[PDB]
Amino acid sequence: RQQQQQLNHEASELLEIAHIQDDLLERLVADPRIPEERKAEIEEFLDGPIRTLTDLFNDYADQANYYDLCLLIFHAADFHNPRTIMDTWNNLINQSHFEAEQRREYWEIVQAGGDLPAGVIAEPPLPYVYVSQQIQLIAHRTSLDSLIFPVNSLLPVVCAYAINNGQDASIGADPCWPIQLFLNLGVPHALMVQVLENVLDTQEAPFTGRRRKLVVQWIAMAVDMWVREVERRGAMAAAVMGSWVSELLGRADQVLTQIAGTGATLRGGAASDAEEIASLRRTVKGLKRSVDMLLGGEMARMSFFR
């Protein structure tokens, strides 16, 4: 069995590298922004024996700014470097945002009569939709167990992008879209709330001032899903949550009381979000109630008939 596994493992690693190399070669040959003279040179060195991950990264993936394949390379190489990983995530998000904005612009010109730039093939997804498509494609290929998904660093970055680029209600997007994304991808509920707590305590920009209203809304949505999950898992077994989650919702209520007060005394006139915040207060209290009941004994009596 040992000799079998060692060969199955060598073939699995070399197959992972080979697919990366094939994805690169195909993309480079098809890229409009690559001169023909270079493409023939790329085809010579990549359509043959499998190359090392260093070369694939330095000589090709990094030169062409294929940041998604850079991340797959950091995964195949067991690359321990959080800072470079996050730099690559930041470049991939920004590159995709600019590409989505460009395609929506070209569209708006068609729907208005103008002419596109020469050699531009004529309702493309909003930028936050194309961005999260890129995150999904990588996650399914790396399985979320990778070091290219440090949720403690990657979730705040994605939330930062949503704020600093208005990927919120103004354009008709769900303001909780970053949370939906990582939950559906299979991030455990406890880890989400744990990170969101750290976002709220440290107050790193842009998560500052009255925009912590949005952080509280993410916490509300995450805890809500967590509660639903626990209730579902209890019914499941008929046929972890600590007091820290309750404390976190209390502080969240205090943040909302602070934001509303500051909003009422702003220069130029009171803030327009008065009832929007009052609603969030009710939701947060409802969640603290549910969490308090579960913590207080209703969680050990979930498999029992009522």
């Binding site: 003279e37 270079r38 990264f57 330095n58 030169q63 690359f79």
Partner: peptide, 17 residues
């Protein structure tokens, strides 16, 4: 085994020779 070396590469956007 990966080793990044931004120093000396080959200009991916220039022909050879």
């Amino acid at each position: 085994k990966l080793v990044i070396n931004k120093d000396m590469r080959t200009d991916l956007f220039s022909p050879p020779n």
